Enzyme design. Sequence first.
Site, PDB file in Angstrom:
ATOM      1  CB  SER A  65      -2.319  14.216  -1.523  1.00  0.00           C
ATOM      2  OG  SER A  65      -1.723  15.115  -0.604  1.00  0.00           O
TER       3      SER A  65
ATOM      4  CE1 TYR B 227      -3.876   2.256   0.123  1.00  0.00           C
ATOM      5  CE2 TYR B 227      -3.217   2.872   2.339  1.00  0.00           C
ATOM      6  CZ  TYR B 227      -4.035   3.054   1.247  1.00  0.00           C
ATOM      7  OH  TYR B 227      -5.011   4.027   1.302  1.00  0.00           O
TER       8      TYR B 227
ATOM      9  CG  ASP C 216     -11.418   3.635   8.396  1.00  0.00           C
ATOM     10  OD1 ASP C 216     -10.632   2.672   8.494  1.00  0.00           O
ATOM     11  OD2 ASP C 216     -12.654   3.517   8.495  1.00  0.00           O
TER      12      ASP C 216
ATOM     13  CG  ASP D 223      -8.815   4.072  -2.615  1.00  0.00           C
ATOM     14  OD1 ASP D 223      -9.726   4.042  -3.462  1.00  0.00           O
ATOM     15  OD2 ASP D 223      -8.424   5.147  -2.119  1.00  0.00           O
TER      16      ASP D 223
ATOM     17  NE  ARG E  14      -1.141   5.651   0.595  1.00  0.00           N
ATOM     18  CZ  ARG E  14      -0.358   5.560   1.663  1.00  0.00           C
ATOM     19  NH1 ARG E  14       0.575   4.629   1.754  1.00  0.00           N
ATOM     20  NH2 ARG E  14      -0.510   6.431   2.659  1.00  0.00           N
ATOM     21  CG  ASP E  15      -5.608   6.270  -0.904  1.00  0.00           C
ATOM     22  OD1 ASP E  15      -6.175   5.163  -0.884  1.00  0.00           O
ATOM     23  OD2 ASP E  15      -4.580   6.495  -0.241  1.00  0.00           O
TER      24      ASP E  15
END
Length: 358
Positions: A95, A83, A313, A135, A88-89
Amino acid sequence: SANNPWTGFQIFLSPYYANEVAAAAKQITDPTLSSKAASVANIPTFTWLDSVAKIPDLGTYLASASALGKSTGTKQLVQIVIYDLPDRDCAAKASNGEFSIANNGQANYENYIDQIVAQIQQFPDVRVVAVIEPDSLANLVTNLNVQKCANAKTTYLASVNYALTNLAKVGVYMYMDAGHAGWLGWPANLSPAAQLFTQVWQNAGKSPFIKGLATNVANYNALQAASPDPITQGNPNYDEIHYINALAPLLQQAGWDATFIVDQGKSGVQNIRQQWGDWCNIKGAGFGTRPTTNTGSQFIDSIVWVKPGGESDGTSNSSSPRYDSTCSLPDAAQPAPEAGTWFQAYFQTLVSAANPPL
């Protein structure tokens, strides 16, 4: 399939999660809740390699597991999440993560994978199961209208490909993240999802170590629901078993007899969300079915706990640079700390609301 990665293996139990849980059981005011809470340290979770700083932890877990295997006469299995994609995401409202496409991000990611491989190479008597990039790929099915995702597409594909190709060389059993029933399980999303996952599998050489897909990671859907959660209206695939039953044959047709793992760590309580897309620290979540290969589906190798329940989260602090407003919706538990850090109040509810009870 014939080869279920878990059968005959003892999962290595994260000492980090065990330490968090033990400290949490001390802070829970009810004594009887405390014994149930303490027992969570015996429930296997995945270790998230969410930065290069976590790679030495992987090395320690491999070496510890090996010694434990030799002491007990068993074969041990270490569970990890890859991950750390650049950008990312991509569809999130802020960010996060150490790598960016604009700053050598893909090359940096390759070096992250190389460091992971170099650890795994040293401990061949330990089995490794990896979930590949939650994700990530799912955004390339439905979120190509998000400019950050459109501009990340080639990097996500190349970086995931590098991970699959190189982790296969050290025999890691891999499940690529595939969202959940309310993301890719909509009937209309199944075909473009299959086209994407199959192309990824082909580019990585169709390695037998690429077992299939992971679903519901860090999410809340039922594996099997007797009645559809109202958030699911319009989607006949209202739980993970419906999604997996629908997607698996499309992968099979390409020559990939894919199997699946399903996160149930935060799925003990259904009917808690206003909208299906609300993902952050949903209020009232309970620990769900404990990890087991007794899944009830031909397609599903294991129920797993990928997200370590109790770790946040994401922050609800709108002054944090990591703030995503999803974490302040009317159904998100607040105030919430930074992602990955311990969220004591949320853990206490996961225990109290655990279903099956702990």
